[PDB]
Short mmCIF file of C-alpha atoms in Angstrom, two decimals:
data_model
loop_
_atom_site.label_atom_id
_atom_site.label_comp_id
_atom_site.label_asym_id
_atom_site.label_seq_id
_atom_site.Cartn_x
_atom_site.Cartn_y
_atom_site.Cartn_z
CA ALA A 47 -0.15 0.00 0.07
CA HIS A 48 0.93 3.58 0.22
CA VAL A 49 0.13 6.83 2.59
CA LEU A 50 -0.32 10.39 1.45
CA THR A 51 2.16 12.81 3.26
CA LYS A 52 2.04 16.82 3.43
CA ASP A 53 4.95 17.38 1.15
CA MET A 54 3.79 15.45 -1.65
CA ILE A 55 0.26 17.35 -1.44
CA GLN A 56 2.94 20.40 -1.48
CA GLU A 57 5.17 19.10 -4.46
CA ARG A 58 2.15 18.34 -6.63
CA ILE A 59 0.42 21.62 -6.27
CA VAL A 60 3.49 23.27 -6.95
CA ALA A 61 4.39 21.30 -10.00
CA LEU A 62 0.64 21.47 -11.16
CA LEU A 63 0.54 25.17 -11.04
CA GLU A 64 4.01 25.08 -13.06
CA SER A 65 2.16 23.60 -15.93
CA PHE A 66 -0.77 26.00 -15.95
CA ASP A 67 -0.64 28.91 -18.55
CA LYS A 68 -2.80 31.71 -17.23
CA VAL A 69 -0.50 31.74 -13.79
CA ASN A 70 1.45 35.07 -13.24
CA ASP A 71 4.89 33.57 -12.71
CA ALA A 72 6.85 30.38 -11.99
CA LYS A 73 8.82 32.08 -9.33
CA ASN A 74 6.12 33.80 -7.32
CA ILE A 75 4.35 30.52 -5.86
CA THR A 76 4.49 30.12 -2.38
CA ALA A 77 2.63 27.81 0.21
CA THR A 78 1.05 30.73 1.17
CA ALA A 79 -0.12 32.51 -1.81
CA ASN A 80 -3.41 33.71 -2.96
CA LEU A 81 -4.65 31.90 -6.17
CA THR A 82 -6.67 34.80 -7.42
CA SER A 83 -4.06 37.92 -6.93
CA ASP A 84 -0.77 36.51 -6.17
CA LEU A 85 -1.00 34.02 -9.30
CA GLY A 86 -3.16 36.29 -11.52
CA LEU A 87 -5.88 34.06 -11.65
CA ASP A 88 -9.50 35.17 -12.54
CA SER A 89 -12.74 34.19 -11.07
CA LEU A 90 -13.11 31.59 -14.21
CA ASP A 91 -9.83 30.34 -14.30
CA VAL A 92 -9.55 29.09 -10.66
CA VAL A 93 -12.22 26.70 -11.33
CA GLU A 94 -10.46 25.51 -14.43
CA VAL A 95 -7.44 24.85 -11.50
CA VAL A 96 -9.77 23.34 -9.15
CA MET A 97 -10.85 20.98 -11.77
CA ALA A 98 -7.23 20.11 -12.53
CA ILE A 99 -6.83 19.72 -8.61
CA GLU A 100 -9.78 17.31 -7.85
CA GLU A 101 -8.81 15.24 -11.11
CA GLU A 102 -5.03 15.00 -10.31
CA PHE A 103 -5.83 14.31 -6.30
CA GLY A 104 -8.45 11.57 -7.58
CA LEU A 105 -10.56 13.01 -5.08
CA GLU A 106 -13.58 15.10 -6.11
CA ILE A 107 -15.41 18.27 -4.10
CA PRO A 108 -18.42 19.84 -4.10
CA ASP A 109 -19.23 23.36 -4.91
CA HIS A 110 -19.70 24.54 -1.32
CA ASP A 111 -16.01 23.99 -0.75
CA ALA A 112 -15.19 25.27 -4.07
CA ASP A 113 -14.87 29.21 -2.84
CA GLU A 114 -13.41 27.92 0.46
CA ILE A 115 -10.05 26.99 -0.81
CA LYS A 116 -9.09 30.64 -2.07
CA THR A 117 -5.28 30.35 -0.91
CA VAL A 118 -3.08 27.58 -1.44
CA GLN A 119 -2.61 26.46 2.31
CA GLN A 120 -6.35 26.18 2.55
CA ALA A 121 -6.50 24.01 -0.42
CA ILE A 122 -3.50 21.94 0.99
CA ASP A 123 -5.15 21.83 4.59
CA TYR A 124 -8.40 20.84 2.91
CA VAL A 125 -6.92 17.73 1.03
CA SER A 126 -4.65 16.74 3.74
CA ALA A 127 -8.15 16.53 5.81
CA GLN A 128 -9.40 13.82 3.83
CA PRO A 129 -8.31 10.35 4.23
CA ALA A 130 -8.96 9.33 0.55
CA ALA A 131 -5.46 9.98 -0.87
CA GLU B 3 -45.20 -58.93 15.92
CA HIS B 4 -47.01 -58.72 12.93
CA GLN B 5 -50.69 -59.13 13.71
CA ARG B 6 -53.56 -59.32 11.57
CA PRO B 7 -56.94 -58.42 12.58
CA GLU B 8 -60.01 -58.81 10.56
CA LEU B 9 -61.90 -56.86 7.89
CA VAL B 10 -65.19 -55.71 8.61
CA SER B 11 -67.63 -54.01 6.17
CA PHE B 12 -69.93 -51.20 6.98
CA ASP B 13 -72.95 -53.05 5.40
CA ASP B 14 -75.01 -55.01 8.13
CA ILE B 15 -72.93 -54.01 11.26
CA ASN B 16 -75.67 -51.85 13.11
CA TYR B 17 -74.52 -48.71 13.37
CA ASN B 18 -74.71 -48.40 17.24
CA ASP B 19 -72.39 -49.92 18.81
CA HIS B 20 -68.46 -48.34 18.77
CA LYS B 21 -66.88 -51.59 18.31
CA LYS B 22 -68.05 -53.13 14.89
CA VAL B 23 -68.23 -49.39 13.71
CA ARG B 24 -64.43 -48.51 14.76
CA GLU B 25 -63.30 -52.20 13.50
CA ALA B 26 -64.67 -51.45 10.04
CA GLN B 27 -63.28 -47.99 9.90
CA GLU B 28 -59.87 -49.39 10.72
CA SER B 29 -60.39 -52.21 8.59
CA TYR B 30 -61.20 -49.97 5.42
CA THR B 31 -58.36 -47.93 6.59
CA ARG B 32 -55.54 -50.37 6.68
CA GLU B 33 -56.88 -52.10 3.50
CA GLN B 34 -56.66 -48.68 1.59
CA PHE B 35 -52.94 -48.60 2.60
CA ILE B 36 -52.87 -52.19 1.33
CA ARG B 37 -54.33 -50.74 -1.96
CA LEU B 38 -51.64 -47.75 -1.73
CA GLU B 39 -48.73 -50.22 -1.56
CA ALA B 40 -49.49 -51.82 -5.12
CA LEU B 41 -48.99 -48.26 -6.45
CA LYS B 42 -45.63 -47.91 -4.43
CA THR B 43 -44.25 -51.24 -5.38
CA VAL B 44 -44.85 -50.62 -9.11
CA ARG B 45 -43.49 -47.45 -9.07
CA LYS B 46 -40.28 -49.26 -7.44
CA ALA B 47 -40.22 -51.47 -10.26
CA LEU B 48 -41.12 -48.98 -13.17
CA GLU B 49 -38.17 -47.02 -12.10
CA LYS B 50 -35.98 -49.92 -12.27
CA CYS B 51 -37.24 -50.45 -15.82
CA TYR B 52 -36.00 -46.98 -16.65
CA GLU B 53 -32.75 -47.71 -14.74
CA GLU B 54 -31.91 -50.80 -17.14
CA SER B 55 -33.38 -49.84 -20.21
CA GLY B 56 -31.96 -46.56 -21.34
CA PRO B 57 -33.15 -45.99 -24.76
CA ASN B 58 -35.80 -48.74 -25.13
CA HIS B 59 -37.91 -48.26 -22.10
CA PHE B 60 -40.61 -46.51 -24.28
CA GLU B 61 -41.27 -50.27 -25.59
CA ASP B 62 -39.77 -52.11 -22.94
CA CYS B 63 -42.47 -51.42 -20.00
CA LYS B 64 -45.16 -49.34 -21.57
CA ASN B 65 -47.43 -51.41 -20.12
CA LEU B 66 -46.07 -50.73 -16.54
CA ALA B 67 -45.56 -46.92 -17.49
CA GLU B 68 -49.55 -46.90 -18.12
CA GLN B 69 -49.97 -49.32 -15.57
CA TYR B 70 -48.70 -46.77 -13.09
CA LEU B 71 -50.87 -44.04 -15.02
CA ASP B 72 -53.99 -45.90 -14.48
CA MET B 73 -53.51 -47.04 -11.01
CA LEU B 74 -52.73 -43.26 -10.00
CA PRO B 75 -56.36 -42.04 -9.48
CA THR B 76 -57.59 -45.04 -8.08
CA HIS B 77 -54.94 -45.76 -5.32
CA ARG B 78 -54.98 -42.97 -2.60
CA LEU B 79 -56.67 -41.87 0.81
CA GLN B 80 -60.39 -41.39 -0.17
CA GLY B 81 -62.01 -41.58 3.37
CA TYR B 82 -64.11 -43.89 5.38
CA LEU B 83 -66.76 -41.10 5.55
CA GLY B 84 -67.71 -41.33 1.88
CA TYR B 85 -68.55 -45.07 1.90
CA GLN B 86 -70.07 -44.64 5.52
CA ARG B 87 -72.07 -41.63 5.28
CA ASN B 88 -73.81 -42.97 1.89
CA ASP B 89 -75.21 -45.90 0.62
CA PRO B 90 -75.02 -47.01 -3.06
CA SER B 91 -78.17 -48.67 -4.60
CA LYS B 92 -80.05 -46.40 -2.54
CA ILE C 25 -48.17 17.98 -2.08
CA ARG C 26 -46.14 16.07 -4.52
CA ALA C 27 -47.84 12.76 -5.90
CA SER C 28 -51.51 11.70 -6.05
CA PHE C 29 -51.80 9.49 -3.33
CA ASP C 30 -49.96 12.28 -1.27
CA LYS C 31 -52.44 14.69 -2.19
CA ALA C 32 -55.12 12.04 -1.68
CA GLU C 33 -53.68 11.56 2.05
CA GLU C 34 -53.81 15.30 3.16
CA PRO C 35 -57.47 15.59 4.15
CA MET C 36 -56.84 12.59 6.98
CA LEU C 37 -54.15 14.39 8.87
CA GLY C 38 -55.27 16.81 11.78
CA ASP C 39 -52.24 17.63 13.59
CA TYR C 40 -49.40 16.90 11.33
CA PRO C 41 -47.63 19.88 10.01
CA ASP C 42 -47.87 18.52 6.24
CA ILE C 43 -44.34 19.02 5.35
CA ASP C 44 -43.26 18.77 1.62
CA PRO C 45 -41.95 15.43 1.11
CA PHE C 46 -38.59 14.89 -0.92
CA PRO C 47 -36.47 11.63 -1.71
CA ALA C 48 -33.32 11.66 0.78
CA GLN C 49 -31.71 9.60 -1.95
CA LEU C 50 -32.27 12.61 -4.06
CA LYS C 51 -30.55 15.30 -1.64
CA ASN C 52 -26.93 15.75 -2.23
CA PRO C 53 -24.86 13.71 -0.26
CA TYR C 54 -22.24 16.19 0.20
CA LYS C 55 -24.14 18.00 2.59
CA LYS C 56 -23.15 16.81 6.22
CA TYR C 57 -26.21 15.66 7.70
CA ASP C 58 -26.55 13.98 11.62
CA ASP C 59 -27.41 10.23 9.68
CA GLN C 60 -24.72 10.27 7.03
CA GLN C 61 -25.93 6.75 6.24
CA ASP C 62 -29.41 8.16 5.75
CA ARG C 63 -28.51 11.72 4.52
CA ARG C 64 -30.75 12.93 7.40
CA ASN C 65 -30.18 15.49 10.45
CA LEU C 66 -31.59 14.69 13.69
CA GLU C 67 -34.78 16.37 14.43
CA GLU C 68 -36.00 16.34 10.80
CA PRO C 69 -39.68 16.54 10.33
CA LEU C 70 -40.34 13.38 8.51
CA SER C 71 -42.83 13.04 5.59
CA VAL C 72 -46.35 11.57 5.80
CA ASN C 73 -45.50 8.35 3.78
CA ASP C 74 -41.83 8.36 4.79
CA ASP C 75 -40.83 5.11 3.35
CA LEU C 76 -41.35 5.83 -0.01
CA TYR C 77 -38.83 8.87 0.71
CA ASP C 78 -36.34 6.70 2.76
CA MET C 79 -33.23 5.90 1.44
CA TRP C 80 -34.59 2.31 1.82
CA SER C 81 -37.17 3.35 -0.41
CA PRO C 82 -37.02 2.04 -3.83
CA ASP C 83 -34.27 3.83 -6.26
CA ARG C 84 -36.32 6.18 -8.42
CA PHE C 85 -34.19 6.54 -11.42
CA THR C 86 -33.81 10.32 -12.06
CA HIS C 87 -32.53 10.64 -15.77
CA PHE C 88 -35.82 10.02 -17.78
CA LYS C 89 -39.36 10.67 -16.71
CA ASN C 90 -41.32 7.97 -15.74
CA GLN C 91 -44.18 8.16 -18.17
CA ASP C 92 -41.27 9.21 -20.89
CA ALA C 93 -39.57 6.14 -20.41
CA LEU C 94 -42.48 3.80 -20.73
CA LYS C 95 -42.56 4.72 -24.19
CA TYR C 96 -38.92 3.83 -24.90
CA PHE C 97 -39.21 0.39 -23.40
CA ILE C 98 -42.52 -0.21 -25.67
CA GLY C 99 -40.61 1.14 -28.43
CA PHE C 100 -37.95 -1.29 -28.17
CA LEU C 101 -40.24 -4.09 -27.83
CA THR C 102 -42.31 -2.87 -30.93
CA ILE C 103 -38.90 -2.60 -33.11
CA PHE C 104 -37.74 -6.37 -31.97
CA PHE C 105 -40.96 -8.33 -32.26
CA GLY C 106 -42.76 -6.40 -35.38
CA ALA C 107 -39.44 -6.63 -37.32
CA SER C 108 -39.00 -10.48 -36.15
CA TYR C 109 -42.70 -11.01 -37.48
CA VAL C 110 -41.64 -9.41 -40.67
CA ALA C 111 -38.72 -11.62 -41.22
CA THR C 112 -41.03 -14.31 -41.12
CA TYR C 113 -42.26 -13.43 -44.46
CA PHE C 114 -38.82 -13.04 -45.77
CA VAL C 115 -37.53 -15.97 -44.71
CA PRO C 116 -35.93 -18.41 -47.59
CA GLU C 117 -36.81 -22.26 -47.40
CA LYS C 118 -34.22 -24.58 -46.66
CA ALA C 119 -32.19 -27.16 -49.24
CA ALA C 120 -32.60 -30.51 -47.79
CA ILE C 121 -35.80 -32.86 -46.93
CA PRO C 122 -36.05 -33.52 -43.42
CA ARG C 123 -34.59 -37.14 -42.85
CA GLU C 124 -36.99 -40.08 -42.64
CA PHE C 125 -36.92 -42.94 -40.55
CA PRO C 126 -36.90 -46.97 -40.92
CA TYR C 127 -39.21 -49.49 -39.18
CA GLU C 128 -42.26 -47.00 -40.59
CA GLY C 129 -40.74 -44.26 -38.53
CA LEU C 130 -39.91 -46.36 -35.39
CA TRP C 131 -43.63 -46.29 -34.00
CA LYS C 132 -42.98 -49.73 -32.47
CA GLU C 133 -39.64 -48.39 -30.90
CA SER C 134 -41.25 -45.54 -29.37
CA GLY C 135 -43.94 -47.98 -27.62
CA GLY C 136 -47.47 -47.43 -29.67
CA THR C 137 -49.59 -49.63 -31.53
CA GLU C 138 -50.97 -49.88 -35.18
CA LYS C 139 -53.84 -48.47 -33.49
CA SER C 140 -51.79 -46.04 -31.80
CA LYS C 141 -49.46 -45.42 -34.64
CA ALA C 142 -51.35 -41.67 -35.03
CA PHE C 143 -49.73 -40.32 -32.09
CA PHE C 144 -46.25 -41.75 -33.51
CA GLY C 145 -44.48 -42.24 -36.55
CA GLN C 146 -42.08 -39.95 -38.07
CA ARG C 147 -41.60 -40.03 -41.64
CA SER C 148 -42.23 -43.62 -42.36
CA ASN D 7 6.69 9.66 -7.13
CA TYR D 8 10.19 11.28 -8.03
CA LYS D 9 9.10 12.72 -11.12
CA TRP D 10 6.55 14.83 -11.16
CA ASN D 11 5.01 16.57 -14.41
CA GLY D 12 7.63 14.63 -16.55
CA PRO D 13 7.94 11.61 -18.47
CA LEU D 14 7.02 8.74 -16.49
CA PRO D 15 9.75 5.86 -16.19
CA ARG D 16 9.86 2.48 -17.62
CA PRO D 17 8.02 0.16 -15.48
CA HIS D 18 9.54 -2.75 -13.55
CA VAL D 19 7.78 -6.19 -13.74
CA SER D 20 9.55 -9.10 -12.18
CA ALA D 21 10.97 -11.90 -14.40
CA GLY D 22 8.69 -14.78 -13.19
CA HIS D 23 5.62 -12.81 -14.59
CA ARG D 24 6.77 -11.83 -17.78
CA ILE D 25 8.04 -15.24 -18.64
CA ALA D 26 4.54 -16.38 -18.04
CA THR D 27 3.49 -13.61 -20.34
CA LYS D 28 5.77 -14.97 -22.92
CA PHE D 29 5.13 -18.77 -22.23
CA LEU D 30 1.18 -18.61 -22.61
CA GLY D 31 1.63 -16.10 -25.49
CA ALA D 32 3.40 -18.69 -27.25
CA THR D 33 1.15 -21.41 -26.51
CA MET D 34 -1.83 -19.29 -27.69
CA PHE D 35 -0.61 -18.71 -31.06
CA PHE D 36 0.89 -22.48 -31.18
CA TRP D 37 -2.51 -23.79 -30.33
CA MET D 38 -3.90 -21.55 -33.13
CA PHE D 39 -1.68 -22.66 -35.75
CA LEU D 40 -2.27 -26.20 -35.19
CA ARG D 41 -5.84 -26.42 -35.06
CA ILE D 42 -6.81 -23.83 -38.03
CA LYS D 43 -4.25 -26.11 -39.92
CA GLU D 44 -5.89 -29.37 -38.71
CA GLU D 45 -9.09 -28.25 -39.97
CA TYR D 46 -8.32 -26.23 -42.59
CA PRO D 47 -10.88 -27.72 -45.22
CA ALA D 48 -13.61 -27.83 -42.54
CA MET D 49 -12.87 -24.86 -40.37
CA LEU D 50 -12.85 -22.48 -43.22
CA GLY D 51 -15.75 -24.03 -44.90
CA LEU D 52 -15.02 -26.33 -48.05
CA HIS D 53 -16.09 -29.31 -49.69
CA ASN D 54 -19.94 -28.67 -50.17
CA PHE D 55 -22.10 -31.41 -49.52
CA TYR D 56 -24.90 -30.90 -52.46
CA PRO D 57 -24.40 -33.49 -55.29
CA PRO D 58 -23.79 -31.30 -58.53
CA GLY E 4 -6.63 -0.72 6.94
CA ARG E 5 -6.39 -1.84 10.46
CA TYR E 6 -8.89 0.27 12.28
CA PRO E 7 -9.68 0.04 15.89
CA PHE E 8 -12.39 -2.46 16.79
CA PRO E 9 -14.18 -2.85 20.06
CA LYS E 10 -12.76 -6.07 21.40
CA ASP E 11 -15.51 -6.95 23.78
CA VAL E 12 -18.05 -8.71 21.61
CA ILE E 13 -17.51 -12.30 20.79
CA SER E 14 -18.58 -13.24 17.73
CA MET E 15 -19.47 -16.68 15.97
CA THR E 16 -17.15 -16.03 13.20
CA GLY E 17 -14.52 -14.45 15.57
CA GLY E 18 -15.29 -11.05 14.84
CA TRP E 19 -13.02 -8.45 12.85
CA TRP E 20 -9.73 -9.98 12.69
CA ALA E 21 -9.64 -13.24 14.83
CA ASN E 22 -6.02 -14.57 14.76
CA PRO E 23 -5.60 -16.65 18.08
CA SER E 24 -2.54 -17.57 18.82
CA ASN E 25 -2.57 -21.25 19.05
CA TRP E 26 -3.90 -21.74 15.72
CA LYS E 27 -1.18 -24.03 14.71
CA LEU E 28 -2.40 -26.08 17.76
CA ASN E 29 -6.27 -25.84 17.64
CA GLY E 30 -5.91 -26.87 13.58
CA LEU E 31 -4.49 -30.05 14.93
CA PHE E 32 -8.14 -30.94 16.33
CA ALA E 33 -10.51 -29.72 13.86
CA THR E 34 -8.65 -31.35 10.88
CA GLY E 35 -8.34 -34.32 12.80
CA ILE E 36 -11.89 -34.18 13.26
CA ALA E 37 -12.48 -33.41 9.66
CA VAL E 38 -10.29 -36.29 8.17
CA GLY E 39 -11.94 -38.72 11.20
CA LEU E 40 -15.20 -37.36 9.94
CA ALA E 41 -14.98 -37.94 6.29
CA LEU E 42 -13.90 -41.46 6.38
CA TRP E 43 -16.19 -42.40 9.17
CA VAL E 44 -19.22 -41.22 6.85
CA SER E 45 -17.80 -42.58 3.54
CA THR E 46 -17.84 -46.20 5.26
CA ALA E 47 -21.48 -45.58 6.48
CA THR E 48 -22.69 -44.27 3.37
CA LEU E 49 -20.93 -47.55 1.64
CA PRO E 50 -24.08 -50.21 1.76
CA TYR E 51 -26.31 -47.26 0.70
CA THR E 52 -24.54 -47.00 -2.53
CA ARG E 53 -25.33 -49.13 -5.67
CA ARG E 54 -24.38 -49.58 -9.31
CA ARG E 55 -27.16 -47.75 -11.53
CA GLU E 56 -26.91 -50.02 -14.80
CA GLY E 57 -27.20 -53.69 -14.03
CA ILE E 58 -28.87 -54.50 -10.70
CA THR E 59 -31.26 -57.03 -11.97
CA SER E 60 -31.81 -58.88 -14.96
CA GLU E 61 -33.60 -57.76 -18.21
CA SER E 62 -35.80 -61.12 -17.98
CA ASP E 63 -37.26 -59.59 -14.55
CA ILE E 64 -38.05 -56.37 -15.84
CA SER E 65 -39.53 -58.41 -18.99
CA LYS E 66 -41.77 -60.62 -16.89
CA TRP E 67 -42.72 -57.63 -15.07
CA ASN E 68 -43.92 -56.43 -18.13
CA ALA E 69 -45.76 -59.18 -18.93
CA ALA E 70 -47.23 -59.15 -15.43
CA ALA E 71 -48.45 -55.48 -16.76
CA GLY E 72 -49.99 -57.18 -19.67
CA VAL E 73 -52.03 -59.78 -17.29
CA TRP E 74 -53.10 -56.82 -15.08
CA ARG E 75 -54.14 -54.72 -17.71
CA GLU E 76 -55.99 -57.28 -20.02
CA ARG E 77 -58.13 -58.14 -16.85
CA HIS E 78 -58.98 -54.53 -16.32
CA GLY E 79 -59.79 -54.06 -20.10
CA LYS E 80 -57.86 -51.15 -21.16
CA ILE E 81 -57.49 -49.20 -24.33
CA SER E 82 -54.45 -48.17 -25.62
CA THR E 83 -53.16 -44.32 -25.27
CA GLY E 84 -53.68 -43.52 -28.76
CA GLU E 85 -57.07 -45.61 -29.26
CA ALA E 86 -60.30 -43.59 -29.94
CA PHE F 4 -24.34 -47.77 -48.15
CA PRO F 5 -24.34 -50.01 -45.15
CA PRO F 6 -27.03 -52.31 -44.60
CA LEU F 7 -30.13 -51.97 -42.16
CA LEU F 8 -29.69 -53.72 -38.54
CA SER F 9 -32.10 -56.02 -37.11
CA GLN F 10 -34.83 -55.09 -34.56
CA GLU F 11 -33.00 -57.12 -31.68
CA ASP F 12 -29.87 -55.06 -32.97
CA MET F 13 -31.39 -51.77 -32.21
CA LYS F 14 -32.85 -53.03 -28.75
CA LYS F 15 -29.25 -54.61 -27.98
CA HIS F 16 -26.80 -51.69 -28.04
CA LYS F 17 -29.00 -49.26 -26.56
CA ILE F 18 -28.74 -46.77 -29.58
CA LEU F 19 -30.24 -43.64 -29.05
CA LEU F 20 -33.78 -42.74 -30.61
CA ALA F 21 -32.68 -40.22 -33.21
CA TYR F 22 -29.47 -42.33 -34.65
CA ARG F 23 -31.39 -45.47 -35.48
CA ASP F 24 -31.51 -45.72 -39.22
CA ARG F 25 -29.84 -47.30 -42.28
CA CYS F 26 -26.61 -45.35 -41.29
CA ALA F 27 -26.42 -47.11 -37.72
CA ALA F 28 -24.23 -49.93 -39.01
CA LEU F 29 -21.15 -48.15 -38.80
CA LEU F 30 -22.26 -46.59 -35.50
CA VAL F 31 -22.28 -49.66 -32.98
CA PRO F 32 -18.40 -50.45 -32.97
CA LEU F 33 -17.99 -46.67 -33.45
CA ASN F 34 -19.18 -45.92 -29.77
CA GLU F 35 -17.81 -49.27 -28.65
CA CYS F 36 -14.27 -48.20 -30.21
CA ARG F 37 -15.18 -45.17 -27.97
CA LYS F 38 -15.60 -46.93 -25.45
CA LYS F 39 -11.81 -48.42 -25.52
CA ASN F 40 -10.76 -44.93 -25.04
CA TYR F 41 -12.06 -42.28 -23.00
CA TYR F 42 -13.82 -39.83 -25.61
CA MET F 43 -10.34 -38.71 -26.66
CA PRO F 44 -10.76 -36.79 -29.62
CA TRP F 45 -7.17 -37.72 -31.54
CA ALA F 46 -8.39 -41.35 -31.41
CA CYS F 47 -11.08 -43.44 -33.30
CA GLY F 48 -11.28 -41.05 -36.69
CA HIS F 49 -11.40 -43.11 -39.43
CA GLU F 50 -14.55 -44.81 -38.41
CA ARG F 51 -16.30 -41.55 -37.48
CA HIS F 52 -15.17 -40.68 -40.83
CA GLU F 53 -16.78 -43.67 -42.20
CA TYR F 54 -19.84 -42.77 -40.21
CA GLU F 55 -19.97 -39.43 -41.88
CA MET F 56 -19.42 -40.48 -45.31
CA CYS F 57 -22.31 -42.74 -44.95
CA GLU F 58 -24.36 -40.09 -43.83
CA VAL F 59 -23.09 -37.45 -46.57
CA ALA F 60 -24.09 -40.15 -49.02
CA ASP F 61 -27.56 -40.02 -47.44
CA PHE F 62 -27.53 -36.24 -47.44
CA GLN F 63 -27.44 -36.22 -51.29
CA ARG F 64 -30.09 -38.33 -51.69
CA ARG F 65 -31.93 -35.86 -48.95
CA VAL F 66 -31.01 -33.15 -51.19
CA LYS F 67 -31.84 -35.06 -54.47
CA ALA F 68 -35.17 -35.52 -52.58
CA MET F 69 -35.78 -31.89 -51.97
CA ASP F 70 -34.81 -31.07 -55.49
CA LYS F 71 -37.44 -33.79 -56.77
CA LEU F 72 -39.92 -31.95 -54.33
CA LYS F 73 -40.04 -28.85 -56.37
CA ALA F 74 -40.55 -29.51 -59.94
CA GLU F 75 -44.53 -30.32 -59.41
CA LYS F 76 -44.34 -27.09 -57.25
CA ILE F 77 -43.63 -25.33 -60.55
CA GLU F 78 -46.06 -27.66 -62.70
CA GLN F 79 -48.78 -26.76 -59.85
CA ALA F 80 -48.22 -23.22 -60.71
CA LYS F 81 -48.22 -23.88 -64.32
CA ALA F 82 -51.98 -25.20 -64.36
CA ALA F 83 -53.31 -21.90 -66.16
#
């Protein structure tokens, strides 16, 4: 078997947003950055981001938590809160 | 021990004493089981015909098979009441 | 309220609150109720005729309308059986004879009698 | 997990499974080439039974 | 997974993960029953088994058909196909 | 064209209902041939080829029968 870790969740989201094109930069990204302002993402762009977030993690999420994860650390702690890796 | 009590009809037994009436009921009962054993025995033989025959059972024991199917409506429990509660030729 | 019998059960109650029934299976699962097994928060006013809106109620498929889907099923029936009956007019006959049998069709072999030959006999 | 968002490596399978793949895949087409050859007039459909 | 389970209840199946310590020992008993069951049954069922084809003679069954004819002629029975 | 069996010959070897015809003569050792082996398909092939050839020769007269069945079927349409 295999067990998820924190830094796995970290490096996945970092390398995830490295492959996206409407990001601002490749060096601005932190563990505490805003998705919207610190990465230049739109209201509509972040939804495509979260779509890739849910597909790449495997796990799917509702719309209720969709505007809950507006910064990177919120999304990391969210996905680490679920036991389905 | 294999005892054999006698057979008593329901005709001319004076339906007031319980002795002859109950004996006649039990006689017409046990004799009906004797009649049933013919059906059971011919079934036991007919299946053995089917066991040995294989394909040609159609012509080996057709008479045994229709013997079974003819005995079927006339070999069962039928009640002592029906002959007791009624009289033919009347 | 919702269905026919639901409105045909309204004038019975005298002190029940008459809530709107809704199938709990068709509530979304991602809301976090008390009973996660039944998508049900604790002090929820149950429906008159609860057990057709339980999770233990039958499934109640949601894509097609019931009355609409009945038409699709009978259409599948018709397109099978009618065209199969049409193919009975379009069938070609076969090329050989059905095969015959000796001993006057083996009527003696399937038991039988000369009197009972009519209920036997295969292509003598 | 060493690679993220790059080319995935060649997978590592053990020898005992891949030899069984080679074995059963050999036997399958070998058995085919037996049976097709052995019934090649019949299996393909030939020598019709209708008198000319 | 190995989530924690309440060890208080005793089930006939054992429960969640029944791995009792003397399984090498108790298996010596039950299999000793099991083998000891089967050969004890197989002998006991032995006189109740028989060979299906060839238990009696054809002559017996043909004479039984003869007895069928003797019965049926006395009852005066038409064939199945006579009308 | 193998000869027809006797009546006791059908009654002896316990030949199945559908199999009892003119062509049954090659059958009664064939199954017996099969009794020597254990129904293994690589064995006893020449005699099943014989039984088949018997039956294909029967098939050709089955077809020539069904051919003969149709000329008067045309002639009945030629009644007008």
